[PDB]
Structure 1
């Protein structure tokens, strides 16, 4: 009757669909992380408080615009808002800070059929027109070929190369050209640096400001990830790198990118300029699938609730897009203009919360858990076996939660990859771990502030009890419900090995 448990019991996916029930209410817990882009509409300490109450887990700062002093003040406000709830550790919600890079860029009426010359000659830097268009990408001729397409201004204008310091092009799709418009080269192996000079300064500032994760723009190959990793350096070795896949080469070389990264963003805006817009859903489902197979976080981004920039309710296509991203297996969903500049930032966050929670209940865990196991390698790793054991146990007794003690987050990540229905309450004393855990579907991170007990086994038990208080206080479960608890046999990371089925006290 609740959380689509009738549908959960269907022996086929078709029958599962047939039983989905709008009058079967979901549980309180919402598993999918919500990433909110902060800007003029959401920047104030007072609005940030409401953003957190509405369900924001990660504050994204877009470094395509704004000064370091500007972003430093946004981060300060985020932390002011976040720590205003710190007095009660039971109810405190960690909030992560994400730095999203500008990344490499190419920058500059026009009738269809007309001929346009692209010039790299610096003489035309401030004198672009209907006949000659200057671009700042010096190696463009080396990466394009006759018949190559060139997009200008967020894909509005389309050119085709006819002759390859210059390129003779024919206007395929025409419109009003302007100053400093963005250029995309579909199918081209663009050889711009992994990080611009601006990016290097921005990433170092990210380390200064103690950010949790970096969303690295325009990642094309594993060596781009390694360059971002190198810039973050020893000091930033624990900041998660999320590679943004934005073009054809990124999609083609996705496997090597995933391996080198901590996670992925499906950057649908630019991806739908670089490849045909009708193919974007294929790229999204492929990347979410492969991330799910690897146990690495994946974010669905861009235009998910776009109309809510101007309207208090989303379109039906937007509601569908959010639900389907969750059903695809996205760990996180994202809001951009909707929260950064729109008239309804709080409504947009609340709607993502509501849809995600409904969608999580409609998941067909029977088949999903079955397939994840089948494709899960047999390894000698004790934590992996303990984690799969915990998820299986959680299904067998419909547990209220899986409670996991973790220093680095890894033990909770290993549970998350198996996609339990039960929320995963990850108890840590490491504040960064608490914040970074929002990247993983199902993890509800809690930061334990209690002193270390003198008997280590008592300290373990204290943290488990803290998780029990959190679940009760947040309405995930009640006294007498059964929960799964994951602990280790000695202190320090890498020793999670104990799964217990326990009553909520």
Structure 2
């Protein structure tokens, strides 16, 4: 009864524009998005978020992956976090239609440089003043006696790799020092950017050739523990070259061969060697914290868009990470730059977005998850699929692989009929990954019986994994129908589609494969 005043939902007016400029001009704050949110949300778990009750609310608010940051905490601490994640996740298991799988990710310490403890108890801070002198020492006598005159750090070969004039950054790149003099085991620096210095802060040496191993002996111990704990993926810090990826993957053994290896790109060499790293990895994280200290801050967006583009071209997941909603560590609403950053990561093409301190340590973890969910849904509708899908196709090789032809045909069909979903029956995730790389607007409901697939599949934009718990039926056709009906019930229960809407169904492995059907929802 409203009539012509109707505003198309999900930015469909902008979707139909014939140019990108007109697409922008048509973006409409009064055009509401769809229910389904395609971009996975990865949340770092820490003191603010590791209780079972908070984790339950995190899941309800949209967390898909729990990140364990092995830069901090001992193995028993991480074991208990994992236990709590699983308790919270399985509290929803009694209803498979509504159960959301939750993945567990181990983020390695890797070749970090860290300072020691401020003298006293270690919880104090000292003020470093601009122009003051500060001695960096490797003498362990001072490892718990750091102050404004002497700073211990843990990188034993630092004096080899820095020179007079080089810059040393401490604590998220906020404190900056210039090396004035060298010693056998010390550096004399001048404070450039001063500030308040606490304990065990991260140190960066931009332009220095740091020779620490990508995977140290202690990192291997963490990785082995990750295998014992049945983690789903590793986020490997400071990957510089393809062989670093192999050091991570091969040490997991046969037992860990299905764990996904995500290389974190956070230094200049990782950017330069990106193509070989991408080839060796299952996916990528744009680890912007270190990256924006190792390279000039003003260049990070170039590296981010380069890596997202190349991952989209390769069909491998890419995560945008770090400081996306940073002010929400302390405030209940984000800044305008933070809102923009989340939206633009999605528009760039990121498969997942991440929260670090906002969920690990901040005062508003649930609000931060909820805000990522809200922004991602709005941005997903604003993507200019007309151009994106054309470019992904043109840049995608002709092959004889019938499964790739099925996937692109399904995504094409999904756009042609504005489908409510692409339902995909998948054991390993592969068939669903193949659809996701063509970036449909419609959500991809990936039905699997493999619990690890259900967890890992969150890494791909658009995949909404659901875990079927029904026994396998002896008749293949009956077993397919059971899994398809499960997906239909999920989409109806979750509000993705209604009876009578059109959906695409890919029925998976058949003992041709992965037949496509375009059907009304029963």
Q: TM-score, normalised by structure 1?
A: 0.93
1:64 and 1:102 in contact (8 A); partners too: yes
Q: Which has the higher mean CA deviation after the structures are superposed, 124-133 or 245-254?
A: 124-133
> How many Å apart are 1:157 and its aligned residue?
3.0
Q: Which has the higher mean CA deviation after the structures are superposed, 375-384 or 140-149?
A: 140-149
2:327 and 2:335 in contact (8 A); partners too: yes
Counterpart CA distance in 1 for 2:139 and 2:432 is 55
2:446 and 2:464 in contact (8 A); partners too: yes
Q: Is residue 219 of structure 1 aligned with residue 239 of structure 2?
A: yes
> How many Å apart are 1:488 and its aligned residue?
3.9
CA change 1:181–1:480 in 2 (3 A) is closer
SS at match of 1:109: strand
Q: Is residue 47 of structure 1 aligned with residue 54 of structure 2?
A: yes
Report the equivalent of 2:28.
21
CA deviation profile, 1:25-79 (whole Å, cap 9, x unmatched): 1111110001111122222222211111111111111122222222212211111
Q: Which has the higher mean CA deviation after the structures are superposed, 461-470 or 365-374?
A: 461-470
Counterpart CA distance in 1 for 2:197 and 2:366 is 36
CA deviation profile, 1:448-473 (whole Å, cap 9, x unmatched): 11111111122122212211111111
1:411 and 1:496 in contact (8 A); partners too: no
CA change 1:311–1:151 in 2 (3 A) is closer
1:219 and 1:225 in contact (8 A); partners too: yes
Q: Which has the higher mean CA deviation after the structures are superposed, 95-104 or 176-185?
A: 176-185
CA change 1:158–1:467 in 2 (3 A) is same
SS at match of 2:254: coil
2:424 and 2:508 in contact (8 A); partners too: no
> How many Å apart are 1:490 and its aligned residue?
2.4
CA deviation profile, 1:431-456 (whole Å, cap 9, x unmatched): 00000000000000011111111111
> How many Å apart are 1:152 and its aligned residue?
2.9
CA deviation profile, 1:69-90 (whole Å, cap 9, x unmatched): 2221221111111111111111
> How many Å apart are 1:416 and its aligned residue?
0.4
> How many Å apart are 1:148 and its aligned residue?
3.1
Q: How does 1:218-367 map to 2 (within 5 A)?
A: 218-367=238-387
2:132 and 2:191 in contact (8 A); partners too: yes
1:189 and 1:249 in contact (8 A); partners too: no
Q: What's the C-alpha RMSD, in Å, of the aligned pairs?
A: 2.2
> How many Å apart are 1:326 and its aligned residue?
0.6
1:213 and 1:436 in contact (8 A); partners too: yes
SS at match of 1:497: coil
CA change 1:65–1:126 in 2 (3 A) is closer
Report the equivalent of 1:199.
219
1:26 and 1:361 in contact (8 A); partners too: yes
SS at match of 2:482: helix
CA change 1:173–1:47 in 2 (3 A) is closer
> How many Å apart are 1:156 and its aligned residue?
2.8
Counterpart CA distance in 2 for 1:109 and 1:343 is 25
> How many Å apart are 1:223 and its aligned residue?
1.4
1:386 and 1:496 in contact (8 A); partners too: no
Counterpart CA distance in 1 for 2:350 and 2:478 is 37
CA change 1:133–1:64 in 2 (3 A) is closer
Q: Is residue 463 of structure 1 aligned with residue 483 of structure 2?
A: yes
CA change 1:127–1:71 in 2 (3 A) is closer
1:219 and 1:246 in contact (8 A); partners too: yes
1:160 and 1:171 in contact (8 A); partners too: yes
CA change 1:210–1:124 in 2 (3 A) is closer
CA change 1:142–1:383 in 2 (3 A) is farther
Counterpart CA distance in 2 for 1:24 and 1:60 is 34
SS at match of 2:328: helix
CA deviation profile, 1:255-294 (whole Å, cap 9, x unmatched): 1111111111111111111112122111111111111111
1:486 and 1:496 in contact (8 A); partners too: no
Q: Which has the higher mean CA deviation after the structures are superposed, 110-119 or 283-292?
A: 110-119
> How many Å apart are 1:404 and its aligned residue?
0.7
Aligned length: 502
SS at match of 1:176: strand
Counterpart CA distance in 1 for 2:164 and 2:427 is 55
Q: Which has the higher mean CA deviation after the structures are superposed, 381-390 or 180-189?
A: 180-189
Counterpart CA distance in 2 for 1:496 and 1:146 is 64
Counterpart CA distance in 2 for 1:316 and 1:176 is 27
Counterpart CA distance in 1 for 2:406 and 2:80 is 43
Q: TM-score, normalised by structure 2?
A: 0.90
> How many Å apart are 1:403 and its aligned residue?
0.8
Counterpart CA distance in 2 for 1:69 and 1:157 is 33
> How many Å apart are 1:131 and its aligned residue?
6.8
Counterpart CA distance in 2 for 1:173 and 1:20 is 42
Q: Which has the higher mean CA deviation after the structures are superposed, 180-189 or 52-61?
A: 180-189
SS at match of 1:446: strand
> How many Å apart are 1:230 and its aligned residue?
2.0
2:422 and 2:442 in contact (8 A); partners too: yes
CA change 1:140–1:76 in 2 (3 A) is same
Report the equivalent of 1:496.
513
2:263 and 2:281 in contact (8 A); partners too: yes
CA change 1:371–1:184 in 2 (3 A) is same
Provide structure 1 residue ranges, at least 5 long, that are not aligned to the other structure. none
CA change 1:344–1:397 in 2 (3 A) is same
Q: Which has the higher mean CA deviation after the structures are superposed, 138-147 or 394-403?
A: 138-147
> How many Å apart are 1:489 and its aligned residue?
5.7
Q: Which has the higher mean CA deviation after the structures are superposed, 351-360 or 172-181?
A: 172-181
Provide structure 2 residue ranges, at least 5 long, that are not aligned to the other structure. 1-7, 115-125
